[PDB]
Amino acid sequence: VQKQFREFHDRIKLAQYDENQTLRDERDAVLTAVREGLKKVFADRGEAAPTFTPFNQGSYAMNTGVKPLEGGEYDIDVGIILNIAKDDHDPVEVKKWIRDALKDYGNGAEIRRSCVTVFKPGYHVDLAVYADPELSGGTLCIAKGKENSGDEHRLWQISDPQGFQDRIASKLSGDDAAQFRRCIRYLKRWRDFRFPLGIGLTAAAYWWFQVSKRTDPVSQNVTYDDRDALEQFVQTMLDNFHDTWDSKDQRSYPRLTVELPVQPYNDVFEKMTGMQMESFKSKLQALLNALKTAKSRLELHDACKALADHFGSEFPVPEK
Ligand SMILES: Nc1nc2c(ncn2[C@@H]2O[C@H](COP(=O)(O)OP(=O)(O)OP(=O)(O)O)[C@@H](O)[C@H]2O)c(=O)[nH]1
Ligand SMILES: Nc1nc2c(ncn2[C@@H]2O[C@H](COP(=O)(O)OP(=O)(O)OP(=O)(O)O)[C@@H](O)[C@H]2O)c(=O)[nH]1
Ligand SMILES: [Mg+2]
Ligand SMILES: [Mg+2]
């Protein structure tokens, strides 16, 4: 079922910031809009505008991006580093700046725990907001907390977005890397279809993903098993679930822990409730049964037909 996974990949992959003129524009369209919006806010105050360094983030930066489904949204992720001290301003306050700036932008802007989200026709931009490392003691620090949140969970947390993008790019090379990237995209479309924060699956793959190839010693021509590579990876993930008592709920929930391989090394999955976590393992187990099925049991049509319960109506199914 490889040539089907390769077709699937071609259908779902979305060109990274570097190879995607039209995504740089919708990113630029929002940065240009911030600076302009920052004049309309930091003039009222009496003080001068804060200046920021933007940079690319997330899957569009790491070449692991997929095209949204219909009635889904492109997820454009930029960081912005403002020249301020982390020990002077308040994380949400600083995010408040960004929202009001983009108020008159698109369908408006919401403050999230780890970014300001802003909306538009058929996409959104998440803007992670950092304190200057120079004014802040040498550590890059992301603004954590929502308008509705306490002060315990108002933080300036040590971050390494470029470090993380780096681990993903560095994991393997050539066609072993290319297999790794195809498998992240497959599971993202699965996420998009049947909901496992894409970072979650990306961190998971960094740790657990193993290449599935057969190398012809005589012909020195290698052949990739994308199907088997996913079954092995998904099994490893399921395997790594541990039953986890919730005393509030007086019930056990299964739970997968995946530490970021860069600072702060948090469990990326830590903000999924034990409820969220069990229906994540339910779907993962459903996905894995389909992947086993496709290796032989069923013939190409019913094989592919199974996968499409998991991967969606863009998974190619041959007619029977
Ligand atoms: N430190 C930290 N950074 C995170 C976390 N979640 C997301 N990020 C960062 O924010 C970026 C965008 O997150 P997402 O949009 O959820 O994921 P993605 O890797 O871009 O993949 P998609 O699912 O295709 O959007 C990630 O690539 C990270 O750099 C987290 O839990 N901790
Ligand atoms: N740079 C960075 N981006 C993050 C991080 N966590 C999440 N994101 C981004 O923020 C987007 C929205 O996710 P969250 O910030 O977790 O959203 P939320 O609903 O406020 O979070 P909860 O309060 O946990 O429900 C994701 O799509 C990511 O792109 C993080 O630690 N670092
Ligand atoms: Mg993203
Ligand atoms: Mg996002």
Coordinates of C-alpha atoms and ligand atoms in Angstrom, one line a residue:
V1 CA 0.0 0.0 0.0
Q2 CA 3.2 2.3 -0.4
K3 CA 2.3 4.0 -3.7
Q4 CA -1.1 4.9 -2.1
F5 CA 0.8 6.5 0.9
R6 CA 3.1 8.4 -1.5
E7 CA 0.0 9.7 -3.5
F8 CA -1.7 10.5 -0.1
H9 CA 1.5 12.5 0.9
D10 CA 1.5 14.5 -2.4
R11 CA -2.2 15.4 -1.7
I12 CA -1.8 16.5 1.9
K13 CA 1.7 18.1 2.0
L14 CA 1.7 21.9 2.1
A15 CA 4.9 23.8 0.9
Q16 CA 6.9 25.3 3.9
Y17 CA 7.3 29.2 4.3
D18 CA 10.5 29.0 2.1
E19 CA 8.6 27.3 -0.9
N20 CA 5.1 28.9 -0.4
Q21 CA 5.0 32.6 -1.6
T22 CA 1.3 32.9 -0.7
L23 CA 1.9 31.9 3.1
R24 CA 4.8 34.4 3.5
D25 CA 2.3 37.1 2.3
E26 CA -0.5 36.1 4.8
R27 CA 2.3 36.0 7.5
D28 CA 3.7 39.4 6.3
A29 CA 0.1 40.7 6.0
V30 CA -0.2 40.2 9.9
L31 CA 3.3 41.5 10.9
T32 CA 2.8 44.7 8.8
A33 CA -0.6 44.9 10.5
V34 CA 0.9 44.5 14.0
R35 CA 3.5 47.4 13.6
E36 CA 0.8 49.6 12.1
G37 CA -1.6 48.5 14.9
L38 CA 1.2 49.1 17.5
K39 CA 1.2 52.9 16.4
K40 CA -2.6 53.0 17.0
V41 CA -2.1 51.7 20.6
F42 CA 1.4 52.8 21.8
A43 CA 0.6 56.5 20.9
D44 CA -2.5 56.8 23.2
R45 CA -0.2 55.6 26.1
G46 CA 2.3 58.6 25.9
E47 CA 5.3 56.2 25.5
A48 CA 7.1 55.1 22.2
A49 CA 6.0 51.9 20.3
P50 CA 7.7 48.6 21.3
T51 CA 9.8 47.1 18.5
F52 CA 9.8 43.3 17.8
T53 CA 11.9 40.7 15.9
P54 CA 9.6 38.2 14.1
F55 CA 10.6 34.6 13.1
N56 CA 8.9 31.5 11.5
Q57 CA 7.6 28.7 13.9
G58 CA 5.8 25.3 13.8
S59 CA 5.1 22.9 10.9
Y60 CA 5.2 25.5 8.1
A61 CA 8.9 26.3 9.3
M62 CA 9.9 22.6 9.8
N63 CA 8.5 21.3 6.5
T64 CA 5.9 19.1 8.3
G65 CA 2.9 21.2 7.3
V66 CA -0.4 19.7 5.8
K67 CA -3.2 21.4 3.9
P68 CA -6.4 21.8 6.0
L69 CA -9.5 19.8 5.3
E70 CA -12.7 21.7 4.0
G71 CA -14.1 24.0 6.8
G72 CA -10.6 23.7 8.5
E73 CA -8.1 26.5 8.8
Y74 CA -4.3 26.9 7.8
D75 CA -2.3 27.2 11.1
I76 CA 0.3 29.9 10.5
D77 CA 2.8 30.1 13.4
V78 CA 5.2 33.1 13.9
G79 CA 7.2 34.0 17.0
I80 CA 7.7 37.8 17.8
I81 CA 10.5 38.9 20.2
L82 CA 9.8 42.4 21.7
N83 CA 12.6 44.5 23.2
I84 CA 11.4 44.5 26.9
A85 CA 12.6 43.0 30.3
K86 CA 10.6 39.8 31.4
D87 CA 10.8 41.1 35.1
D88 CA 9.2 44.5 34.3
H89 CA 6.0 43.7 32.3
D90 CA 3.2 41.1 32.7
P91 CA 2.8 38.3 30.2
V92 CA -0.9 38.8 29.4
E93 CA -0.6 42.6 29.4
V94 CA 2.0 42.2 26.6
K95 CA -0.3 39.8 24.7
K96 CA -3.2 42.3 25.3
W97 CA -1.0 44.8 23.3
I98 CA -0.9 42.4 20.3
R99 CA -4.8 41.7 20.3
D100 CA -5.9 45.4 20.3
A101 CA -3.3 46.1 17.6
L102 CA -5.0 43.4 15.4
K103 CA -8.6 44.1 16.7
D104 CA -9.7 45.7 13.4
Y105 CA -7.8 42.7 11.7
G106 CA -9.9 40.0 10.0
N107 CA -12.5 38.5 12.4
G108 CA -10.5 39.8 15.5
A109 CA -8.0 38.3 17.9
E110 CA -8.1 36.1 21.1
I111 CA -5.5 35.6 23.8
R112 CA -4.4 31.9 24.3
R113 CA -2.1 30.4 27.0
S114 CA 0.9 30.3 24.7
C115 CA 0.1 32.8 22.0
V116 CA -2.3 35.5 20.6
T117 CA -4.5 33.8 17.9
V118 CA -6.0 36.1 15.1
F119 CA -8.5 35.0 12.4
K120 CA -9.2 35.6 8.6
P121 CA -10.7 33.8 5.6
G122 CA -9.9 30.1 5.9
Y123 CA -6.8 30.5 8.2
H124 CA -5.6 31.9 11.6
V125 CA -2.2 33.2 12.8
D126 CA -0.8 32.1 16.2
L127 CA 1.8 34.7 17.4
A128 CA 4.0 33.5 20.2
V129 CA 5.3 36.6 22.1
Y130 CA 8.8 36.5 23.8
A131 CA 10.8 38.8 26.1
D132 CA 14.2 40.0 24.7
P133 CA 16.9 37.6 25.9
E134 CA 19.4 40.7 26.3
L135 CA 17.0 42.6 28.7
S136 CA 15.9 39.3 30.4
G137 CA 19.3 37.7 31.5
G138 CA 20.2 35.7 28.4
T139 CA 17.2 33.2 28.3
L140 CA 14.5 33.6 25.6
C141 CA 11.2 33.6 27.5
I142 CA 7.6 33.0 26.1
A143 CA 4.6 34.8 27.7
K144 CA 2.3 32.1 29.3
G145 CA -1.2 32.8 30.7
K146 CA -4.8 33.7 29.5
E147 CA -6.9 36.8 30.5
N148 CA -9.1 34.4 32.6
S149 CA -6.1 32.7 34.3
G150 CA -4.6 33.1 37.8
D151 CA -1.0 34.4 38.5
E152 CA 0.5 30.9 39.4
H153 CA 0.0 30.2 35.6
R154 CA 1.1 33.7 34.5
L155 CA 4.7 32.8 33.7
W156 CA 7.8 33.9 31.6
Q157 CA 8.9 30.3 30.6
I158 CA 12.4 29.5 29.2
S159 CA 11.7 28.6 25.5
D160 CA 13.7 27.1 22.5
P161 CA 11.4 27.2 19.4
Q162 CA 14.5 27.3 17.1
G163 CA 16.2 24.5 19.1
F164 CA 13.0 22.3 18.6
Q165 CA 12.7 23.1 14.8
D166 CA 16.4 22.1 14.7
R167 CA 16.1 18.7 16.4
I168 CA 13.3 17.8 13.9
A169 CA 15.5 18.9 10.9
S170 CA 18.6 17.1 12.4
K171 CA 16.9 13.7 13.3
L172 CA 17.9 11.9 10.1
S173 CA 19.0 12.9 6.5
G174 CA 18.0 12.3 2.8
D175 CA 15.3 9.7 2.5
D176 CA 15.3 8.4 6.1
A177 CA 14.4 12.1 7.0
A178 CA 12.0 12.3 4.1
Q179 CA 10.1 9.2 5.5
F180 CA 10.1 10.7 9.0
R181 CA 8.5 13.9 7.6
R182 CA 5.9 12.0 5.5
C183 CA 4.8 10.1 8.7
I184 CA 4.4 13.3 10.8
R185 CA 2.1 14.7 7.9
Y186 CA 0.1 11.4 7.7
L187 CA -0.7 11.7 11.5
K188 CA -1.5 15.4 11.2
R189 CA -4.2 14.7 8.5
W190 CA -5.4 11.9 10.9
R191 CA -5.5 14.5 13.7
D192 CA -7.3 17.0 11.4
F193 CA -9.8 14.3 10.3
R194 CA -10.7 12.6 13.7
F195 CA -10.2 15.4 16.2
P196 CA -2.9 15.1 19.9
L197 CA -1.5 18.7 19.5
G198 CA 0.7 18.4 16.2
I199 CA 3.7 19.3 18.4
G200 CA 2.7 16.2 20.5
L201 CA 3.0 13.8 17.5
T202 CA 6.1 15.7 16.2
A203 CA 7.9 15.4 19.6
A204 CA 6.6 11.8 19.9
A205 CA 8.2 11.0 16.4
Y206 CA 11.5 12.7 17.3
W207 CA 11.7 10.2 20.3
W208 CA 10.1 7.0 18.9
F209 CA 9.9 7.1 15.1
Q210 CA 12.0 4.4 13.4
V211 CA 12.6 4.2 9.6
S212 CA 11.0 1.2 7.8
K213 CA 13.0 0.4 4.6
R214 CA 14.3 -2.7 2.7
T215 CA 17.8 -2.2 1.1
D216 CA 18.7 -4.4 -1.9
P217 CA 22.4 -5.3 -1.1
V218 CA 22.9 -6.4 -4.8
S219 CA 21.1 -3.4 -6.5
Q220 CA 21.9 -1.0 -3.6
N221 CA 18.4 0.4 -4.3
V222 CA 16.4 1.1 -1.0
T223 CA 12.5 0.8 -0.6
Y224 CA 10.5 2.5 2.2
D225 CA 7.6 1.0 4.1
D226 CA 5.5 4.0 5.2
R227 CA 2.7 1.7 6.4
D228 CA 5.0 -0.4 8.6
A229 CA 6.9 2.7 9.8
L230 CA 3.6 4.2 11.1
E231 CA 2.4 0.9 12.7
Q232 CA 5.8 0.6 14.6
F233 CA 5.6 4.3 15.7
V234 CA 1.9 4.2 16.7
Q235 CA 2.5 0.9 18.6
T236 CA 5.4 2.5 20.5
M237 CA 3.2 5.5 21.4
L238 CA 0.2 3.3 22.6
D239 CA 2.8 1.1 24.5
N240 CA 4.1 4.2 26.3
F241 CA 0.6 5.0 27.8
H242 CA 0.4 4.4 31.6
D243 CA -2.9 4.2 33.6
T244 CA -3.2 7.4 35.7
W245 CA -5.5 7.8 38.7
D246 CA -7.6 11.0 38.9
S247 CA -8.7 11.4 42.6
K248 CA -11.1 14.3 41.7
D249 CA -12.9 11.9 39.2
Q250 CA -12.2 8.8 41.4
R251 CA -11.3 7.1 38.1
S252 CA -8.2 5.9 36.2
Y253 CA -7.5 7.5 32.8
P254 CA -4.7 6.2 30.4
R255 CA -2.2 9.0 29.7
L256 CA 0.9 9.5 27.3
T257 CA 3.8 11.7 28.5
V258 CA 6.0 13.2 25.8
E259 CA 8.8 15.6 27.0
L260 CA 9.9 18.3 24.6
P261 CA 13.6 17.6 23.7
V262 CA 14.4 21.3 24.3
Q263 CA 13.5 23.8 27.2
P264 CA 11.4 23.7 29.2
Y265 CA 11.2 19.8 28.6
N266 CA 7.5 19.9 29.6
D267 CA 5.1 17.0 28.8
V268 CA 3.6 18.5 25.7
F269 CA 0.4 16.5 26.4
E270 CA 0.1 17.8 30.0
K271 CA -2.9 20.2 29.3
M272 CA -5.0 17.3 27.8
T273 CA -7.6 16.3 30.5
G274 CA -7.6 12.5 31.3
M275 CA -11.0 12.5 29.5
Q276 CA -9.2 14.1 26.4
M277 CA -6.4 11.5 26.8
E278 CA -8.6 8.3 26.7
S279 CA -10.4 9.3 23.5
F280 CA -6.9 10.1 22.0
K281 CA -5.8 6.5 22.8
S282 CA -9.1 5.2 21.6
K283 CA -8.5 6.8 18.1
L284 CA -4.8 5.7 18.2
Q285 CA -5.8 2.1 18.8
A286 CA -8.5 2.4 16.0
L287 CA -5.8 3.9 13.7
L288 CA -3.3 1.0 14.6
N289 CA -5.9 -1.8 13.9
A290 CA -6.4 -0.4 10.4
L291 CA -2.6 -0.2 9.7
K292 CA -2.2 -4.0 10.7
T293 CA -5.2 -4.9 8.5
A294 CA -3.7 -3.2 5.4
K295 CA -0.4 -5.2 5.6
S296 CA -2.1 -8.3 4.0
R297 CA -5.5 -9.4 5.5
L298 CA -7.7 -7.2 3.2
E299 CA -7.1 -6.6 -0.6
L300 CA -6.0 -3.1 -1.9
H301 CA -9.6 -1.7 -2.0
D302 CA -10.7 -2.8 1.5
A303 CA -7.1 -2.2 2.8
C304 CA -7.2 1.5 1.6
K305 CA -11.0 1.6 2.5
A306 CA -10.0 0.9 6.2
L307 CA -7.2 3.6 6.3
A308 CA -9.8 6.1 5.0
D309 CA -11.9 5.8 8.2
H310 CA -8.6 7.2 9.8
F311 CA -6.9 9.3 7.0
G312 CA -10.0 10.7 5.3
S313 CA -11.6 10.8 1.8
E314 CA -8.2 12.1 0.3
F315 CA -6.7 8.7 1.1
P316 CA -6.7 7.1 -2.4
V317 CA -9.0 4.0 -2.6
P318 CA -8.8 1.9 -5.8
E319 CA -12.2 0.7 -7.1
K320 CA -13.0 -3.0 -6.4
Ligands
LIG1 N1 7.7 24.8 24.5 C1 6.6 24.4 23.8 N2 6.5 24.9 22.5 C2 5.3 24.4 22.0 C3 4.3 23.6 22.5 N3 3.3 23.4 21.6 C4 3.7 24.1 20.6 N4 4.9 24.7 20.7 C5 5.6 25.5 19.7 O1 4.6 26.1 18.8 C6 4.8 25.6 17.5 C7 3.5 25.4 16.8 O2 2.6 24.5 17.5 P1 1.5 23.7 16.8 O3 0.8 24.7 15.8 O4 0.6 23.0 17.8 O5 2.2 22.6 16.0 P2 3.2 22.3 14.7 O6 4.4 21.6 15.0 O7 3.3 23.6 13.9 O8 2.2 21.4 13.8 P3 0.7 21.6 13.2 O9 -0.1 20.6 14.0 O10 0.8 21.2 11.8 O11 0.2 23.0 13.5 C8 5.6 24.3 17.7 O12 6.3 23.9 16.5 C9 6.5 24.7 18.8 O13 7.6 25.4 18.4 C10 4.5 23.2 23.9 O14 3.8 22.4 24.5 N5 5.7 23.6 24.4
LIG2 N1 5.7 29.0 20.9 C1 4.8 28.3 21.4 N2 3.6 28.1 20.8 C2 2.7 27.4 21.5 C3 2.9 26.7 22.8 N3 1.8 26.0 23.2 C4 1.0 26.3 22.2 N4 1.4 27.0 21.2 C5 0.7 27.5 20.0 O1 -0.6 28.0 20.5 C6 -1.6 27.4 19.7 C7 -2.9 27.3 20.6 O2 -2.6 26.4 21.6 P1 -2.6 26.8 23.2 O3 -1.8 28.1 23.3 O4 -2.2 25.7 24.0 O5 -4.2 27.1 23.4 P2 -5.1 27.4 24.7 O6 -6.5 27.0 24.3 O7 -4.9 28.8 25.2 O8 -4.6 26.4 25.8 P3 -5.2 25.7 27.2 O9 -5.3 26.8 28.2 O10 -4.1 24.6 27.6 O11 -6.5 25.1 26.7 C8 -1.1 26.1 19.1 O12 -1.7 25.9 17.9 C9 0.4 26.4 18.9 O13 0.7 26.9 17.7 C10 4.2 26.9 23.4 O14 4.6 26.4 24.5 N5 5.1 27.7 22.6
MG3 MG 1.4 24.7 13.6
MG4 MG -1.0 26.9 16.0

